[PDB]
Amino acid sequence: RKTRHDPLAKSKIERVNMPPAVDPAEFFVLMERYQHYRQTVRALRMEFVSEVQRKVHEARAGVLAERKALKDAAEHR
Amino acid sequence: PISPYKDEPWKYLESEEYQERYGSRPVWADYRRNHKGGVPPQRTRKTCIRRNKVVGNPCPICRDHKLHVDFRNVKLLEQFVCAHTGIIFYAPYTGVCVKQHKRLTQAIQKARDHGLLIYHIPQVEPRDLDFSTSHGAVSATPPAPTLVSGDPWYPWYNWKQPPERELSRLRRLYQGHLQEESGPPPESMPKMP
Amino acid sequence: PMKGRFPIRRTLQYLSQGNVVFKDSVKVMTVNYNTHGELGEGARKFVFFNIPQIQYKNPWVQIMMFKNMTPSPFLRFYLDSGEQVLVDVETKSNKEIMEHIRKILGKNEETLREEEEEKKQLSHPANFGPRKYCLRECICEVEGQVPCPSLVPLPKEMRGKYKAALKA
Amino acid sequence: PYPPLLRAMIIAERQKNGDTSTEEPMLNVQRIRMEPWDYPAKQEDKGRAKGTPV
Amino acid sequence: ETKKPTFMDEEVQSILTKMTGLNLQKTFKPAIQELKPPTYKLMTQAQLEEATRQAVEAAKVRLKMPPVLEERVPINDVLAEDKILEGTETTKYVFTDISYSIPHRERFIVVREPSGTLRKASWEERDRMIQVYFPKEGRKILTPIIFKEENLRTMYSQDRHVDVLNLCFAQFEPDSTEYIKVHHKTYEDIDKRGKYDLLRSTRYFGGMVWYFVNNKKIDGLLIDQIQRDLIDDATNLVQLYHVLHPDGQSAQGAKDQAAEGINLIKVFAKTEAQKGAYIELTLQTYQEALSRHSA
Amino acid sequence: KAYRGGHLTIRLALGGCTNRPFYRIVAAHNKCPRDGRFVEQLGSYDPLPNSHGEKLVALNLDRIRHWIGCGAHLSKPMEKLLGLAGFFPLHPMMITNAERLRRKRAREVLLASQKTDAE
Amino acid sequence: KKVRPRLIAELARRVRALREQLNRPRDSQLYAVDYETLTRPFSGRRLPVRAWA
RNA sequence: AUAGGUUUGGUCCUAGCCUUUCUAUUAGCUCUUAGUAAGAUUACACAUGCAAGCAUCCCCGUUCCAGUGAGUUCACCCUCUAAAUCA
Ligand code: FES
Ligand SMILES: [K+]
Ligand SMILES: [K+]
Ligand SMILES: [K+]
Ligand SMILES: [K+]
Ligand SMILES: [Mg+2]
Ligand SMILES: [Zn+2]
């Protein structure tokens, strides 16, 4: 792809991009769907983050992990 | 030529002619490839018959037109498998051309699939440690409230006609760049009569 | 033939037969042994036969050997906490010395099994990719799925060359 | 409600662990405060155009 | 109250284990496979008996009987019906959960149909997908043609019943319809043509006995055992029949007459056994021969 | 290759041969090439119907959740695949595209009917 | 392992950062607009069609 | 390597060279079809066209992808801790 330094093409100097025509009924319905959809996904994401964080903590300082560490120390002694 | 055994290929191997030509040795016992050097080329010739013309030193299969490589000619196929290990000899071993080695390999596999050729079938372990079918994955999941009532899983799947005030806002914002308003979609997918 | 006495010691098979995998605490192992005397034969045999096996299984543990510094042979292990484990090995055979250190400082067979199972999970059977990492390279290898175009040509209707010809 | 599949997987864990309950798993969306797309952003963290003049 | 023994009960397992037998030469028959130079050890008689004992232990693991399971019930559960998606896609999507550390029977495999219904995969689809992603050695995604009636009858003509059984165990799951069908059709052919020795000293004998006892056709097996001087096994077979059919004429007959040993065969032969006449003649011949050797 | 910024994304890496597409679901750095370095393979997607008339999708759901919980974004085609599986809600654009198709096909039935009726 | 110093790479870096602070364009220059062509003369970029009104 | 040819009038030993095998480029001569894969010798010089936009202005992106192999132990592990994603 082009770099910032590369010059712009002569053909594209006069090109103007026109936005698509908007359908009112479809536009509003779609906007709400995105709001609801993204709210549901954000809740799911939050739940997945909590699970990951909990698993890491459990491995680091979980009761079973600490118990194993103490058992290993006792066996060594 | 036209061999009379194409329909019943197994008959040739029990005929008198076969016993006079081959006896009890495999059909390839006497074949020797002609090549330069002491180490032979690691592939055999592609085909012994080109455009219905046979080459100078035809391979064991192509030199006799009555030997038909068929999944039913089990006695012929057995000659090309190791009795002690069950592996199909690679083509340089017997000297069959690549074309006939491919046909032999396919026929040997077809005979083994049909049960005509015996091969070692091992005793395998069970796939699963537990055979319980009580987990929800395989059992019936309690139906969700929306599924029982016939509603969409999430309410925003269904089309809800927007209020008129909101439609006016969009018609003000996109002045001069508006499409025909669309009503509620058809309740089910139509079909071309 | 292979050079040296007991050439078996210089084979990967022999070097992998060591059963002493030190716990992560062990950092240094100093082997003090005497070259002569009947009471030190086991230590001499332990240095001759078993140090190669121990080092092969514990590449990051420093093993240093000292000859004829003390009247009797002994082992000393320096742990990461700073504890020093002195193991007197006089009168013991090389087999006894090896079993003694496995008990006090060697990982048990359960600990080793677990580590090997964790390695199993690194390779997933379902994953597709190069043969170095995965069993199969493409889904086309799975029977029933559309074969590779290189082996079985695709129908003209499924090929882009003629998809756009039928349309235009 | 949880989506179809996730719901079925949470109910199966309950039964596998032994907990017998008929309550429906549901996502708490009260924490998620969905703001409008045209809400003023933080100008402090916004960048600036560079010096290259035409 | 009074539960009838299951196939995996310790009592049934002991009976069926002994009935099977242990021929070390058959269990460890030389396999036609890629070979390696054999190794040799200089062993004393004591050491030779210890190695033979270890072979008996290993052989008993190889003969461990597969558990007999009841036919799995078809899965027909709909997770959701998104009718909006109807008509959008022409082909169904099969989604397989490939999370490594999950028992294969606890995996969620669902199908999105073109109508929009998200349904759990059928037992057949479930097994096909597990092979696609967790391929098992000896299992094929597409059912091998060997299992067709015509192809299975050639295998029987060659006395390759054990081979048919090993193929079935590798391809099909123990509770699948195809699995149960094939084993049932193999067991029937053994009975019709009296080939019970083919499955002796194999892990498939117990299943064959279980099929015969629960379908009340233990006549052929009893005759063979007597003809082969296996009374202990024949008596145990009749005993087991009584335990699985306690409210039966033979069971009551043995109870009424307190029959034991050979008597159990006579009581069963007359009352319930279909071939009562043939059994008596066969049992008669044996008892006469046994009396001679005793002299 | 240390990129400037970027983020992890779960996306479809195109494999296969000409006219035989095959996708591998991979968690890769946003800036990495489509078919280049990836962090972890999370499934596969055969878009061609097989002999049984199935489009096969594998989803390592345990690891997909782990990566979404570590801040991995999602491509639109990947979000739509999880919607069809039922792991996420149906993406709004599949609903709208389904409705657009319904309207198109409903309009097609008028012209067809008129032709048969009028002529 | 001793990396050879690159002094010109650091000199130019400091000079650039400095010039970016002394020759920085003002909001008058950056956010100017020609109300006939509707283009920012600083960069010569057209505004989006939806903002023209 | 399962080896082979070659020192001499001849033998044995040692030894180099070469042969037979498998790939990749180029040359000569020759060449029907289909699918697929791969594809400047040169970090030498380059005509022409195109390869980065998006968007209610601000920002963001053009630091990516793509290319090359000139230079060359900057790539791996550990420790520590920026920027970045998780609104
Ligand atoms: S390697 Fe699978 S399509 Fe070619
Ligand atoms: K030589
Ligand atoms: K050429
Ligand atoms: K923008
Ligand atoms: K280079
Ligand atoms: Mg930070
Ligand atoms: Zn030939």
* Alpha carbon distance F110, F104 (integer Å): 10
Solved with = cryo-EM
Q: What is the signed CA dihedral for E173, E176, E179, E185, rounded to 10 degrees?
A: 170
* Alpha carbon distance D17, D9 (integer Å): 13
CB contact burial C106-139 (16+ within 10 A = b; e otherwise): bbeeeeeeeeeeeeeeeebebbbbeeeeeeeebb
B140 CB inside 7 Å of strand H: no
Pick the atom of ligand 1 nearest to C139's CA. 2
DSSP G9: H
For residue E259, how many C-alpha atoms fall within 13 Å in the half-sphere facing its CB?
21
Q: Say whether F46 and C139 touch across the interface (CB within 8 A).
A: yes
How many angstroms separate the alpha carbon of residue F4 from the centre of ligand 6? Answer: 14
Residue C168 has a CB neighbour count (10 Å cut-off) of 4
CB contact burial G4-39 (16+ within 10 A = b; e otherwise): eeeeeeeeeeeeeeeeeeeeebeeeebeeeeeeeeb
Q: Which residue has the tokens 């210890």?
A: E50
B35 CB inside 7 Å of strand H: yes
What crossing angle do the helices spanning E262-271 and E249-257 adopt, rounded to 10°? 140
CB contact burial B153-191 (16+ within 10 A = b; e otherwise): bbebbebeebeeeebeebeeebeeeeeeebeebeeebbe
E-contacting chains (≥3 CB pairs under 8 Å): B, C, D, F
Which ligand sits closest to the CA of G45? 4
DSSP C87: E
* Alpha carbon distance B123, B144 (integer Å): 45
Q: Say whether B135 and E84 touch across the interface (CB within 8 A).
A: no
Residue F18 in contact with ligand 1 by CB distance below 6 A = no
Domain of residue C72, residue span: 1-164
For residue F1, how many C-alpha atoms fall within 13 Å in the half-sphere facing its CB?
12
Q: Which residues pair with E119 in a beta bridge?
A: E78, E111
CB contact burial C14-43 (16+ within 10 A = b; e otherwise): bbeebebbbbeebeebbbbbbeeeeebbbb
User: Strand order in C26-33's β-sheet?
Assistant: C62-67, C26-33, C74-79, C84-88
* Alpha carbon distance A22, B177 (integer Å): 7
Q: Which sign, positive or negative, has the C-alpha torsion G11, G14, G16, G19?
A: negative
* Alpha carbon distance B55, B47 (integer Å): 9
Distances (CA, A) of A41 to E43, F67, F98: 71, 14, 21
Q: For residue A19, which amino acid is it?
A: P
D-contacting chains (≥3 CB pairs under 8 Å): A, B, E, F, G
Chain F residue closest to D9 (CA)? F87
Residue C61 in contact with ligand 1 by CB distance below 6 A = no
D49 CB inside 7 Å of strand H: yes
* Alpha carbon distance E210, E69 (integer Å): 12
Q: What is the signed CA dihedral for F105, F109, F112, F114, rounded to 10 degrees?
A: -140
- Chain H nucleotides near the protein (CB, 7 A): 1, 3-4, 19-22, 34-37, 49-66, 73-74, 83-87
Phi-psi region of D10 (alpha: psi -120 to 50; beta: other; left: phi over 0): alpha
Q: Residue C48 phi/psi, 5° resolution?
A: -70, -45
Pick the atom of ligand 1 nearest to C148's CA. 3
* Alpha carbon distance C45, C41 (integer Å): 6
Collapsed DSSP state (helix, strand, coil) of residue E19: helix
Q: Say whether A17 and G49 touch across the interface (CB within 8 A).
A: yes
For residue F16, how many C-alpha atoms fall within 13 Å in the half-sphere facing its CB?
23
* Alpha carbon distance E96, E121 (integer Å): 9
Residue F15 in contact with ligand 1 by CB distance below 6 A = no
Closest CA to E126 of E109, E106, E142: E109
How many angstroms separate the alpha carbon of residue E110 from the centre of ligand 1? Answer: 26
Residues contacting residue C14 through CB under 8 Å, at least 6 positions apart: C8, C52, C53
Query: A4: which nucleotide lies closest, measuring CA to C1'?
Result: H62
Q: For residue E101, which amino acid is it?
A: S
Q: Say whether B136 and D1 touch across the interface (CB within 8 A).
A: no
Query: A48: which nucleotide lies closest, measuring CA to C1'?
Result: H86
Q: Say whether E80 and D4 touch across the interface (CB within 8 A).
A: yes
Chains E and B touch (3+ CB pairs under 8 A): yes
How many angstroms separate the alpha carbon of residue C2 from the centre of ligand 2? Answer: 26
* E188 and E217 Cβ atoms separated by less than 8 Å: no
On chain F, the residues whose CB falls within 8 A of the CB of D3 are: 86-89
Which of residues 1 to 30 on D have a Cβ less than 7 angstroms from any strand H atom?
Answer: none
Q: Euclidean distance between the first and final Cα of chain C, in Å?
A: 76
Structural domains in chain F (count):
1
Residue C148 in contact with ligand 1 by CB distance below 6 A = yes
A77 CB inside 7 Å of strand H: no
Q: Where are the alpha helices (DSSP H) in chain F?
A: 61-68, 76-85, 92-118
Domain of residue F15, residue span: 1-115
On chain B, the residues whose CB falls within 8 A of the CB of D3 are: 153
* E84 and E115 Cβ atoms separated by less than 8 Å: no
Q: Which residue has the tokens 């063979």?
A: E224
CA angle in degrees (0–180, nearest 5) for E273-E192-E31: 125
Residue E267 has a CB neighbour count (10 Å cut-off) of 23
CA angle in degrees (0–180, nearest 5) for D3-D8-D12: 150
Chains A, D: CB contacts within 8 A come to 19
Query: G31: which nucleotide lies closest, measuring CA to C1'?
Result: H57
Closest CA to E282 of E198, E196, E220: E220
* E77 and B141 Cβ atoms separated by less than 8 Å: yes
The pair of structure tokens assigned to A56 is: 């890491």
User: For residue F63, how far is the Cα from the chain centroid?
Assistant: 18
The experimental resolution of this structure, in angstroms, equals: 2.6
Q: Which residues pair with C66 in a beta bridge?
A: C32
Q: Say whether F112 and B193 touch across the interface (CB within 8 A).
A: yes
Distances (CA, A) of E170 to E138, E149, E165, F54, G16: 6, 18, 9, 25, 72
Q: Say whether E79 and D9 touch across the interface (CB within 8 A).
A: no
Which of residues 130 to 149 on C have a Cβ less than 7 angstroms from any strand H atom?
Answer: 149
B87 CB inside 7 Å of strand H: no
Structural domains in chain C (count):
1
Give me the numbers of helices (H) and strands (E) for chain E, helices first please: 13, 4
CB contact burial E57-96 (16+ within 10 A = b; e otherwise): eebeeebebbebeeebeebebbbbbbbbbbbbbebbbbbb
Closest CA to B116 of B74, B58, B176: B74
D46 CB inside 7 Å of strand H: yes
Pick the atom of ligand 1 nearest to C147's CA. 3
From the CA of B43 to the C1' of H24: give the distance in Å.
Answer: 19
Q: For residue B174, which amino acid is it?
A: Y
User: Mutating which of F41, F45, F61, F63 best tests the E interface, going by the most E Cβ atoms within 10 A?
Assistant: F61
From the CA of B43 to the C1' of H29: give the distance in Å.
Answer: 25
Chain F residue closest to A51 (CA)? F69
On chain A, the residues whose CB falls within 8 A of the CB of G49 are: 16-19
Q: Residue C90 phi/psi, 5° resolution?
A: -70, 135
C-contacting chains (≥3 CB pairs under 8 Å): E, F
What crossing angle do the helices spanning E231-244 and E205-214 adopt, rounded to 10°? 50
